[PDB]
Amino acid sequence: SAPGVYVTPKNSVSSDIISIDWSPVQTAPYTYWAVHNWNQGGEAGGYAGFQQQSGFDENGKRTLHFAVWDPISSKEAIKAEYVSPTSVASNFGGEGTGLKIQTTYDWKNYNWYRMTMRSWQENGHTKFGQWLKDVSKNQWKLIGIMDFPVPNVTFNYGQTLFQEDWLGNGQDVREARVKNGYGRNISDKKWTSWNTQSIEGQEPLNNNWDGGATSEYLWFKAGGDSRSTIGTGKTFTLNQPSQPEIGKLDYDVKSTYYENEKLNITWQLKDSSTPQFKGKIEIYNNENMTGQPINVINDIKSYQNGISQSISLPTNTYAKIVLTDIFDQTVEKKVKIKNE
């Protein structure tokens, strides 16, 4: 019974990547911030964000959320392709063929969290991935990947943030901040900057909410003694870069050996690295890695830190590891294949 509040980009478009930064300020129990929403009333309608479940603070249950409705064009269920160590997947939607992934995550008041989603095509299906950057720690994490049984779906429309009191407790204030809203366009693979966004209470009759902007972020609240200073809603601007600030992909090879016809190669992304999206490894018979590789190991997954493969190799081979991040930046490493 605190009113819902929406923060909606004025000029968003069909996207394959969607990103926003969020920071909680006041956190009543049973507050859900759906910082990304897409395709409502269309195929693969869904949302993702943060939730204060029990409590008012860090001692209560805090989580990330990610849900996608029952597929419309397929009778089949969405599968949890990846869930992180603190994530749990469950059935979701009116007929239980949707999916939600809830992740225990110890996010903190006044700290910033980047949530970046990506959708892509794989094996005739659409995959939806959730990644989270803990800005203070400067650490990315892969959260979850859903395997949706219909090809060619993206984040087509519907971009908005919603702050909801789901249980009824209008007397507790809930407040948070957002910034750095960007999407990557399906049309041309360029970025769209959500520099202009409207803050609007879900019911124009109820003024128990407020919003505004500093030069760094948009802020919004509902509940308690909140009283709108911006009427029924208002548009605010942030003067942010036209392109998002993307980090660098950096990693280290940890093992590279061949023995009893089994090749083992492992790597580890640096703690500050952008997260891994895909990989391949090309194996050459010469150090300069000229000509065609004698072998390729393809389809290394976002969540894959190594290969273990039975393979016939000559005595002196050289491996070129090619990793690409969720922003399609590629970084290569060259290593000689030992006999551990």
Side-chain angles (χ1 to χ4, degrees), residues 315-331:
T315 307
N316 289 306
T317 62
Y318 298 83
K320 198 207 254 83
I321 305 179
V322 184
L323 306 181
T324 142
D325 73 13
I326 64 167
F327 310 100
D328 294 332
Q329 304 180 304
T330 297
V331 166

Side-chain angles (χ1 to χ4, degrees), residues 294-312:
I294 44 159
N295 305 247
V296 190
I297 300 165
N298 280 308
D299 277 68
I300 289 158
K301 307 295 169 155
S302 52
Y303 43 81
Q304 181 173 350
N305 319 124
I307 65 95
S308 197
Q309 192 171 308
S310 209
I311 192 164
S312 278

Side-chain angles (χ1 to χ4, degrees), residues 207-229:
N207 71 346
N208 188 26
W209 68 280
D210 197 15
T214 67
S215 64
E216 3 291 318
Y217 59 70
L218 264 58
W219 64 265
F220 44 91
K221 59 193 199 183
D225 67 350
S226 306
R227 197 188 174 265
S228 179
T229 65

